[PDB]
Design a protein around this ligand. Structure first.
Ligand SMILES: Nc1ncnc2c1ncn2[C@@H]1O[C@H](COP(=O)(O)O)[C@@H](O)[C@H]1O
Ligand SMILES: Nc1ncnc2c1ncn2[C@@H]1O[C@H](COP(=O)(O)O)[C@@H](O)[C@H]1O
Ligand SMILES: [Mg+2]
Ligand SMILES: [Mg+2]
Lengths: 422, 422
């Protein structure tokens, strides 16, 4: 059994970022940029009013003036010069006419005289300062400025910046394509009604398909494979040559006489490890396979026990997906938190204990912080121990009872911005 | 100007959960359950071995015994009784034959005699205890137990539990459908190359489409609408009758003479507010419209300034989407953090200052915690102030300089499990 830290380092060293591709603006969302983005023109590209009001010559000061033009957009006020003793109406974002050097917001003005008469006049009620409420050319974004860089993940504001810069085709790192299969003569499809003797519904495959969908990767569902070496070899050979980047199997990695995942991965590629010092998920197998005349394919022989399967996905597969997708920081978020109840650690293996965590105004020590509740019994066959679990507490192998109020490290495994509040 | 707390309470009171629908297993991912889920059979449904090894009568103890059957799945060992003085081979998950009451893992056994001879014999090397390494019927899930409840959000483990229970069609609350449009005579499509005088690319629409896609809602893109009252009325009437649940407009809510969003929403429905005491995003308008002979449609007249547009989406629209989608806890995650640099608060309006936050082993006070860096100048026209921003610091309206190391409340606006580590 190699430590988890070493297993993660091995996976990281073998995992390579995928070749970049060109995608459309909305396909770029969630992906990591593979090129810098420079603004082709300034923002604003023209001097723009911050307010609805009047563009003035600041030195004129308070008084009554004729309104010589109106400027809201496009060519409004083109060729008109605001000279001392005149003003122009402007709306927010409107081009400032030549000659005007400040804007007086409409609340500091009063329209004078009958509206019916063509000559519009306005009283400016304050003494403004040059440059007031004007956005000079490029004050928000300078022409040729780098607005986004290589290695930056694209969220909603980054899509907004791409649109600002007129970019609708984007160079990004793609997400890996993942093949998933289940193994076992005891499995039946999850559509089964009454179960026959010695049968269970395949739950890992749908759980892993959902887990991969949450990571925004395309899934190739290869179904249930029986405990037959030739059949599993055929499906693995078909998966490796299909074009996928990652293969996830579950089950068939214990010490049974019909567990063929480990020997087949040894035969097809290079197995870096098959045993990890952790609770749950000891039989985790990792291999690199080269596809026939090519590309490399990463294979995770995940444990069959449902808890172990999902915990290994969260700890080892998620950072691999992110590394392949070009993330510079693929590691999960780790925080420090206080236990709401006592927890016994294992005497030999460090445990990834499932918990429901929340941020509290008082974490028990008189200062705000995260707190955690266990999901109960941690047996690897008990998928209910993963239910609602948004974190894995990292319990060292001391064998002692960690009392309520003691502090531990925890890996956050589900969208921290989707955390239910205290 | 009403306080943000009051604006949020108004939006919450008007926002109603959508009628539930029936979806397929993979469509249920990310949605909130609208029914409880009970296990139709136990897990395991038969007494199952935890190990690869031999099923024994525990009272026999160490000795040499004939192997009378092999049990891995299905009907293996059906009709065979393990009597005192006999054992049966089992694999993990295999049915325990009748009569056996414990499992001795293969590492505590030794096969005796020539394999060629049909009579297989094994030496049990330890004294086991009744019930060892057996999962009794229902130890993981009892038959008829509630495995998921109404109001629970479906993640990967919950998909795993639905598959365990044989549920492939699920009753859930759906996501709202959102219509989005931009307003302005100064706008051009983001595909525009050289900009004409007084033109800018429409960036809010693509930014909002991306923001809504991140919330997993269907988008109806209604494009750019000019500053013409009749045209905007036609598009709003078309949006309201289309079947969408939420309409998002941006711009056209300032004090200009061609800003028609507020008066049109007043004309079509009930405007609850049009001014909020906050920096940025003061002109935010909220309305409830009833669709023609029906359903209610929520409308947000978002500010045109890009920062204000996105901050209002994050604070007001995201919890509305979640409430409509049946979330019991729609509020965003709020944490407490320390400032990495000084920040000046505004003297009148509480500010939602954009920051890049991270968890540190030392937050500056000698204990672990979140820390924040400002994204720089906070002007509402500067979309670069949203770039990489994963939090909004809630700065009260004191007008004082908050020194580096001081603690503030912060709203987390992007997947906390996608946070780049320190
Ligand atoms: N797809 C699956 N869904 C649910 N349980 C499984 C699945 N695959 C294997 N198991 C169970 O996990 C345990 C370990 O399986 P294995 O790793 O094949 O020995 C056994 O109890 C199996 O029945
Ligand atoms: N879709 C958009 N994209 C970028 N900027 C916008 C958009 N809509 C309005 N604006 C700008 O936001 C500011 C306020 O607009 P409005 O609310 O229409 O007065 C002005 O500077 C507009 O040019
Ligand atoms: Mg198996
Ligand atoms: Mg406008």
């Amino acid at each position: 059994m190699i430590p988890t830290e070493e297993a993660l380092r091995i996976v990281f060293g073998v995992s390579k970022r995928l070749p970049p591709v060109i995608v459309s603006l909305y396909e770029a969302l969630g992906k990591v940029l593979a090129e810098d983005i420079r603004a082709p023109d300034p923002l604003p590209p023209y001097p723009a009013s911050v307010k609805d009001g009047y563009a003035v010559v600041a030195s004129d000061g308070p008084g009554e003036y004729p309104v010589i033009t109106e400027s809201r957009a496009g060519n409004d006020g083109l060729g008109v010069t605001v000279t001392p003793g005149t003003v122009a109406y402007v709306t927010t974002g409107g081009p400032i006419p030549d000659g005007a050097d400040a804007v007086v917001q409409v609340e500091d003005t009063k329209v004078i005289g009958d509206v019916s008469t063509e000559s519009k006049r306005v009283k400016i009620l304050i003494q403004t300062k040059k440059g007031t409420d004007i956005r000079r050319v490029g004050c928000d974004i300078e022409k040729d400025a780098t607005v986004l860089t290589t290695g930056e993940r694209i969220g909603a504001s980054e899509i907004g910046l791409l649109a600002t810069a007129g970019v609708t085709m984007v160079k990004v790192y793609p997400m890996p394509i993942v093949a998933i299969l289940s193994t076992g003569d005891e499995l039946v499809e999850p559509t089964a009604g009454t179960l026959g003797r010695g049968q269970i519904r395949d739950s890992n495959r749908a759980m892993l398909v959902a887990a991969v969908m949450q990571q925004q990767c395309k899934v190739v569902d290869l179904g249930i494979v029986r405990d037959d070496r030739k059949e599993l070899e055929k499906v693995l050979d078909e998966a490796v040559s299909s074009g996928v980047d990652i293969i996830l199997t579950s089950g068939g990695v214990s010490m049974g006489d019909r567990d063929f995942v480990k020997p087949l991965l040894e035969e097809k590629g290079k197995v870096y490890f098959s045993k990890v010092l952790m609770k749950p998920g000891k039989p985790l197998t990792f291999a690199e396979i080269r596809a026939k005349p090519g590309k490399t394919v990463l294979a995770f022989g995940l444990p069959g026990n449902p808890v172990s399967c999902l915990v290994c996905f969260n700890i080892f597969v998620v950072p691999t997906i992110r590394q392949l997708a070009g993330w510079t920081s693929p590691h999960p978020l780790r925080v420090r938190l206080r236990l709401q109840e006592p927890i016994k650690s294992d005497p030999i293996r460090p445990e990834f204990h499932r918990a429901i965590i929340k941020w509290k105004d008082n974490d028990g020590s008189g200062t705000p912080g995260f707190v955690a509740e266990s999901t109960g019994h941690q047996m690897s066959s008990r998928l209910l121990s993963m239910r609602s679990a948004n974190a894995l507490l990292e319990l060292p192998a001391t064998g002692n009872v960690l009392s309520a109020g003691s502090s531990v490290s925890a890996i956050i495994v589900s969208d921290i911005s989707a955390f239910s509040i205290d």
